[PDB]
Amino acid sequence: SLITVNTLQKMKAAGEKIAMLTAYESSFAALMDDAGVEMLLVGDSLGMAVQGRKSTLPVSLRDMCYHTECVARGAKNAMIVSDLPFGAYQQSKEQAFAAAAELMAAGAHMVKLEGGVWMAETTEFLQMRGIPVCAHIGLTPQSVFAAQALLNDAKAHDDAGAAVVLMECVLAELAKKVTETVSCPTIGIGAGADCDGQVLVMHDMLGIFPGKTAKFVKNFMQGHDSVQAAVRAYVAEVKAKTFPAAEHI
Amino acid sequence: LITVNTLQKMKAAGEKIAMLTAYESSFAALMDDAGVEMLLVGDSLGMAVQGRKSTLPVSLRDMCYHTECVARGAKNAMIVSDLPFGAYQQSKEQAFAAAAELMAAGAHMVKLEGGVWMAETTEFLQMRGIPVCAHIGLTPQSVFAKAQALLNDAKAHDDAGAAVVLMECVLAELAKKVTETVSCPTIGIGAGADCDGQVLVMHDMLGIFPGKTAKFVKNFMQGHDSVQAAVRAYVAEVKAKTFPAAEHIF
Amino acid sequence: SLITVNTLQKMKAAGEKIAMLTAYESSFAALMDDAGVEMLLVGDSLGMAVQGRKSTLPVSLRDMCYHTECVARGAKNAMIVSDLPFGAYQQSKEQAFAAAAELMAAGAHMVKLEGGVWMAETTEFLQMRGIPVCAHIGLTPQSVFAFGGYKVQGRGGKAQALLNDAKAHDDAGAAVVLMECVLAELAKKVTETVSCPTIGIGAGADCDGQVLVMHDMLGIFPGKTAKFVKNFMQGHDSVQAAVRAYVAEVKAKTFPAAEHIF
Amino acid sequence: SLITVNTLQKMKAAGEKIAMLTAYESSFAALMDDAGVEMLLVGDSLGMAVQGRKSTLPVSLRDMCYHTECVARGAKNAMIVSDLPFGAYQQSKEQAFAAAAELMAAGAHMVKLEGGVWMAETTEFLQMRGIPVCAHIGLTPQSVFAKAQALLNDAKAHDDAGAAVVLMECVLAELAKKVTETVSCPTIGIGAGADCDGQVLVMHDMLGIFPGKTAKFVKNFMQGHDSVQAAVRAYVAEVKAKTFPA
Amino acid sequence: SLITVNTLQKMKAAGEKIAMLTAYESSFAALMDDAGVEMLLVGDSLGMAVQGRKSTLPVSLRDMCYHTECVARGAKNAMIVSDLPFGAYQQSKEQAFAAAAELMAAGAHMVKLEGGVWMAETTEFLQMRGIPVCAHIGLTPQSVFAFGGYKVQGRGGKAQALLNDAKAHDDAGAAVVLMECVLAELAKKVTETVSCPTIGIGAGADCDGQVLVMHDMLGIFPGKTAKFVKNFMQGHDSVQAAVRAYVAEVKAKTFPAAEHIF
């Protein structure tokens, strides 16, 4: 029942697409879990969607731990992934370990960190100590104010033992090559359907914000009269390989 | 008084060491009076005492508190305290600070989880007067995250000066080889009978949880009239080498 | 509309001068944004202009964070650059990162640090982790007691060292290099050599942009302004007109004039 | 007058035995000072004698600073030596320095640390920064829960690092003798024989405050006298006459 | 007017003796500044003259910052030098920097640290980051318990070690090198060898300047002062005049006299 890293490995081998959605509260976490969502991402994207800030930089380790605890009270079988917030882990591998440990004590089953080859040593340090790491490469929103290289980043984390490699806004053809090159499962957002799974910010896919949605995002609320049905459709289109479509790439 | 030297003599003589977890003073005095030689204040208290789903949320404060409670009840038995998740893996210096607090709380030895990558930490602590029990094989703090590696882990800790090597859920024949290879006494749980001693979580062996006991666990309460007799039977079986039996091994 | 690092790079390539001014409050930040200031510098110069102290050394990270938040609530399109205060970042690249992360969480889009080649590793450490860096070379006011005051840099055989400081920061990935009190001809060479945009104060008009302390250019202090500073309030009808004349003279390359250059 | 490291060096050179005793309070420290005790050791042994614990490991840095302050208000001429408590200085030489600096600020004139060769770097670090160090080798109570050439190596490494004094506990007398003869600094012993430049005893032990058999290498000096003052003076006289340890 | 490092360098080259005195309060600081004292030393000597302790070791960084602030409210032209107190800087160059930064934030224009060649790296770390350093060599009072009291330095084969200490600091960028209780002939050779000004106390008249503890030179203690100290209060009936006499004798090279030199 419970989704573990082995489960994700089996899904990658079986070619069965993984469904990930961000979650910041207990009620929505339980709803998504029950709707088939396999990975619950307590992302630092909550700085915009929950806190209403202009970027994710101000989110603190305290905020991430609080939301992790909330989500942990609602989740059952889904795996809880928590982001390491800006400033809380890039100082050193030792600082990253301390911040990751706090998230794990709050209820996370894996942590997500941003960065390329320069973060590979941090991934290894954490994974060796029992903390599953999700390496976030490509577009890394914490550096918002700031092909071979992406492949290198991917490989570096894989070699260090990252459990999952997540790619944001990447040429679909490159995401495909990456997914085939790394031993660990991959998760995409604006990276195509050749990844081992997909992720989207709940709020975006529920159409909580006015005006058009990002190009790589699909509104799943539309056509449904219940949030649970909207999420179920997401899981199904992810697995059907219908999402992302050609328009979302 | 049970000391490291006592354990060493027992290994050399083939006399099995009886270890049991303990998180409270009353149970600790009872186990001590019932012949338990090593009291393990383990982070297993996150599940048995705190009721969590894992031992990761256990803090250093929690370990020091439980160690202090056990220390008020213990007499002859050695107190072993676990370094909790996040409090010692950052560096050897951080592990020494955390272990120093546990020793200050009443521990006579500390236990830490990890393979070869933690051996340098074992050496740093042992050289500074802090006896270390290196816990290898199935390390519960890594639940969310292979025969030769285990052997490598055991050798590295032994060479680093580990006072004791504890193995959890390890193929029996592998455990026997490790035990015959390292110089320090070995303790097992789900590791077979060829270790120098055994450990079990108190509540498990007392049948506190409903349902079937884990495979490597035996209910010692059953067939006895008191907690005292259940514990004495556990100690007597470990020493008679009747526990664990074929049915409790992998 | 929003001013980003790419905007500055496009302006350097086009030869359009960048207008930077200091800002420590929300109302003045909004006034300057509306008057066309592109970069709003929350400088540690507030230790003197706001706090009334004799130098910028006593300014703390908390003071820097507070003013940054204030300015962030008034800014609109302009980029916010916040100074890393004395004592909060020179201890190590790790300490600099932590201090810079607090400023970015306070609302900064870039941080400014003082120092030559010995700070380039710090610049690299921060930029690689998403924190845009402005390297400030030449006369660095946090080292005022070591310099003994405000002297022009790059004289004689000191030119190479300044050039070396600029290069190390640029190679370390500095987004912008800021020069203060530097021989104009040297600043021109530096600007023509580094890949990143440059900003000057008392560095001549051949930098890719200019900066002035608000209070200096508004003639808030009694007496005369420094030689490299022009009083724009004087001869103008409002604070809004004074700032607009500054941005216009910077873009027309009339400020700094010959009188304001070393 | 005042007892300085120079005083101790001169005493070793002349063969005049040094009297050291533990002290954790102001009143007893002033009494011992007046009785001729030259070195007052504020030891982590207070964890057992004062606090009543089973070991000295739980003694904290705050406890050592407190007792150091108390003793410093009683002491006049004697040198105050303060122990660096378990867990407060073994993390690194930088940590030891911060802990030693707190003890010096509380009134100590020298600090004592436990450990062989692996602690010599720490000794060098502290001594180079003005903190006199007493290196404690042999039996080190802080490692209670956890050979001739090893002892000599430890003593030599500490002496080469600049230790002001080397303290030996429970060492074969003949071996203590060689160490004393080979190091440039004064040596102090406890259960180390009379061939040391000086002796130390825990005050409560030599005053017979503990119920039970007197420790083997300890002599009860309270016996035969009717004042604590006379008991201390007798210990100092026997140490000087080289009749203790017997 | 305003005393800077450049001023001290100009005086060394000119042969004009620098007058330094300790100061722990604002009133006395203003008086000395008005009497011509060029360097006001907020020394850890306040542990004995102000706090009444037996040594300067118990003085904390907080104490140093507090007195530094007091002195800064009275100082006008004089340069404020603050001592780094025992335990606050010897742990590492990084810790020395953090402590030195607090002193500078409290009002100091330079910090003073005790130590030989082993502290030179710390000297370099500080000066490069804008903190002027006065290296104190010879008899370093924070090491009094290791020293076994106060004793003359530099005789025999120890002379070369002292020279090394001074040159190591001079090479690291020390702004000033202070010598306490060193053979006069050695102090002279060191003064003629390093590039920075030198200040002495019990080091002869050939240093570039002198320093005394205020309370010692005002005769505040009972009995006699050390051999290298002179009571300037005697023969005068105002502290103003007593301080002016110190300044005059230092500049005339009449103090220290033969009787105050080793």
Ligand SMILES: CC(C)C(=O)C(=O)O
């Ligand atoms: C877009 C996803 C991967 C994310 O980083 C977040 O929600 O924080």
Ligand SMILES: CC(C)C(=O)C(=O)O
């Ligand atoms: C039983 C042993 C393996 C243990 O770690 C614990 O109780 O925490």
Ligand SMILES: CC(C)C(=O)C(=O)O
């Ligand atoms: C650009 C200059 C004037 C500066 O550093 C400041 O204002 O803080």
Ligand SMILES: CC(C)C(=O)C(=O)O
């Ligand atoms: C006498 C001078 C050099 C001093 O160190 C002090 O006052 O602290």
Ligand code: NA
């Ligand atoms: Na994120």
Ligand code: NA
């Ligand atoms: Na455990």
Ligand code: NA
């Ligand atoms: Na500035």
Ligand code: NA
């Ligand atoms: Na001083």
